[PDB]
Amino acid sequence: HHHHHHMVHITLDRNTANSWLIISKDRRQVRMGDTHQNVSDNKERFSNYPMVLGAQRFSSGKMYWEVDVTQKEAWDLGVCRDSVQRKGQFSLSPENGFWTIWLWQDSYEAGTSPQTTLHIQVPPCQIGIFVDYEAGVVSFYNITDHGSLIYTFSECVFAGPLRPFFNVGFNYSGGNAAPLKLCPL
Ligand SMILES: COCc1nnc(N)s1
């Protein structure tokens, strides 16, 4: 791919984070804390899952960013509508306003309904996410494997402003404490 030149500087929005997340001072890293992080509750916070949004909102153009997933066992990444549900249980699907992939139990899947099996030969340490708003495209790239394509959502019906979307995953196993990190340009 040749998408690197649409690179954007993404920062995390503390106000949207689940109350157990810890976001770094530079707003570029997030990890699961071992307890409630002593913040007040608000209507923006994801209640049920260890999720957080980027601060940036996109309604046009082409955007590209990269996320470090080194040594994590579980995570979700992609984009979502600014108006996605925050409270209670929900599935990650385009019908619910999410364009995502994930790692779970040693398999990678795209968040279609129902979910789609991904075929990745080289487990990624860094993921590139590309959004073309006008074209209705969200694509994922394996930075560890020379930028190879992972998955493309096409004919996307965004139906609103988009935000970068992150899930650090639970850490029931004691093997998923590592952060998600936004990689430098
Ligand atoms: C000010 O926030 C009001 C709230 N209502 N539901 C929550 N989860 S917190």
For residue 40, give the CATH number of its domain.
Answer: 2.60.120.920
Amino acid identity of residue 43, one-letter, is: K
Instruction: Decide if 95 contacts 89 (C-beta within 8 A).
Output: no
- Residue 15 and residue 12: Cα distance in Å, rounded? 9
Furthest-apart CA pair in the chain: how many Å? 43
How buried is residue 64: exposed, middle or buried, by Cβ count under 10 Å (0-12/13-18/19+)?
buried
**Cα→Cα distances 41→16, 33, 68, Å:** 10, 16, 28
Tokens, residue 115: 């979910």
- Closest C-alpha residue for ligand 1 atom 1: 42
Nearest CA to ligand 1 atom 5: 43
48 in contact with ligand 1, CB cutoff 6 A: no
**Which is the closest atom of ligand 1 to the Cα of 43?**
2
Question: Domain tally for the chain?
Answer: 1
- Measure the CA–CA gap between 173 and 26, rounded to whole angstroms: 28
- Parallel, antiparallel or unpaired: strands 98-104 and 75-81: antiparallel
β-strand partners of 167: 51, 76
CA distance 91 to 49: 11
Amino acid in position 166: F
Documented resolution in Å: 1.3
Could you tell me how many residues make up the chain?
Answer: 185
Q: CA-based angle 117:73:52, to the nearest 5?
A: 90
**Residue to substitute in 41, 44, 45, 86 for testing ligand 1 pocket (most ligand atoms within 8 angstroms of CB):** 41
Amino acid present at 74: A
Q: Residue 72 belongs to what domain range?
A: 4-182
